[PDB]
From TrEMBL:
Signal peptide limits: none
Keyword Phosphoprotein among UniProt keywords: no
Name of this protein: Alpha-2,3/2,6-sialyltransferase/sialidase
Organism encoding this protein: Pasteurella multocida
Chaperone as UniProt keyword: no
Binding site for CMP 1: G242, K285, H287, S312, F313, E314, S331, S332
Length: 377
């Protein structure tokens, strides 16, 4: 019998966690691996060192039918070690479960490892504040059973359904915020139900790698020597962090780009509401999917040092290269940032994201700043 490891994520944070998993397990050159990480391209000089290494496109938050061609190459008993984005877990596993239906005698699910998309899960859970969570859990388990038995998806509570995987498989959840599950009292039945099936995302993992693995990991995440040297300058630093919109609406993307540029000006200009001081070196950490929103900043700002957008902010924490101050639009990156490094967090326009951050003490009780409430400088 054979284990096949699948690394699946259309987003950013779960993929970053999974690249660490790959690094920790990188000595085994023959272990079958299937990478479905949309935002990441494993360098060819790494692929070359591995056999039984496979790549699958994601479409509509699920591996395409090309997954089946890969799995067909392993005609014996196979156990699937699946790494998943939590918010998209139901769709991402969908084709794996379809394949299993057709190959009942040889395909099993060994275990799930699940990682937060990021703030998304917490914003979603916040919207469930007024529900009987204990009862939502039981209904979600029942409906998960219907899914596993019929292949059909129908959840009364899609959000709670994300957390009932243990009723079917050995699972481990990796949470951006374990504090949220403790502090949100309405969620106490969920914390109790999840028992010993969860842990916090471990940001000390990198410090524990061998020098060789640390180098390997940095290559995976794109943290090159040029970027490292730019952050090793001996001057106090501010990193302005970008956001993106999922709206494939051009007018919305253009509005975001404009508001974000104006927000940067509020941090960096002396007359800005959020003025940080003249002594800072200014950096830009665009959102991985900002695209033309990122370009807008670089084309329209000055005296700013770009940090390549696909480099996850959290890599700076691992490498001990965090700046003095960080500011920009509310982001998953702010959940693991030391409090002393927050300049200001700004929201796009009872806001559940605001509520999430307030519950966690990431922001205080003062009036939140939305970016449409900032004067155009
Ligand atoms: N400016 C940004 C925004 C996001 N990100 C990465 O993408 C993830 C999800 O962030 P968002 O919640 O902003 O979509 C983060 O945890 C961070 O790794 C980044 O590296 N730089």
């Amino acid at each position: 019998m054979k284990t096949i490891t699948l690394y699946l994520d259309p987003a950013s944070l779960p993929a970053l966690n999974q690249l660490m998993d790959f690094t920790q397990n990188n000595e085994d050159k023959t272990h079958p691996r299937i990478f479905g990480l949309s935002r990441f391209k494993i360098p060819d000089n790494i692929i070359t060192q591995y056999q039984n290494i496979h790549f699958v496109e994601l479409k509509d938050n699920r591996p395409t039918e090309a997954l089946f061609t890969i799995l067909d190459q392993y005609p014996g008993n196979i156990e699937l070690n699946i790494h998943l984005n939590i918010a998209h877990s139901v769709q991402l596993i969908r084709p794996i479960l379809a394949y299993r239906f057709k190959h009942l005698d040889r395909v099993s699910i060994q275990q799930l490892n699940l990682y937060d998309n990021g703030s998304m899960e917490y914003v979603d859970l916040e919207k469930e504040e007024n529900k009987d969570i204990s009862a939502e859990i039981k209904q979600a388990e029942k409906q998960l059973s219907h899914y596993l038995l019929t292949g059909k998806i129908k959840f009364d509570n899609p959000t709670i359904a994300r957390y009932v995987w243990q009723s079917a498989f050995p699972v481990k959840y990796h949470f951006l915020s374990t504090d949220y599950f403790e502090k949100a009292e309405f969620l106490q039945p969920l914390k109790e139900y999840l028992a010993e099936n969860y842990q916090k995302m471990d940001w000390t993992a990198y410090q524990q790698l061998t020098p060789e693995q640390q180098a390997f990991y940095l290559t995976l995440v794109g943290f090159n020597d040029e970027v490292k040297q730019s952050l090793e300058v001996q001057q106090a630093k501010f990193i302005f962090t970008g956001t993106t919109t999922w709206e494939g609406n051009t007018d919305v993307r253009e509005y975001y780009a404009q508001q974000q540029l104006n927000l940067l000006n509020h941090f960096t200009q002396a007359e800005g509401d959020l003025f940080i001081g003249d002594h800072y070196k200014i950096y830009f950490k665009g959102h991985p999917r900002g695209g033309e929103i990122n370009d807008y900043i670089l084309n329209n700002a000055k005296n700013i040092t770009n940090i390549p957008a696909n480099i996850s902010f959290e890599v700076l924490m691992m490498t001990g290269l965090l700046p003095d101050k960080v500011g920009g639009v509310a982001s998953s990156l702010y959940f693991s940032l030391p409090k002393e490094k927050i300049s200001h967090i700004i929201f796009t326009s009872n806001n559940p994201y605001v509520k999430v951050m307030r519950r966690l003490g990431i922001i205080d009780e003062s009036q939140v700043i939305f970016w449409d409430s900032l004067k155009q400088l």
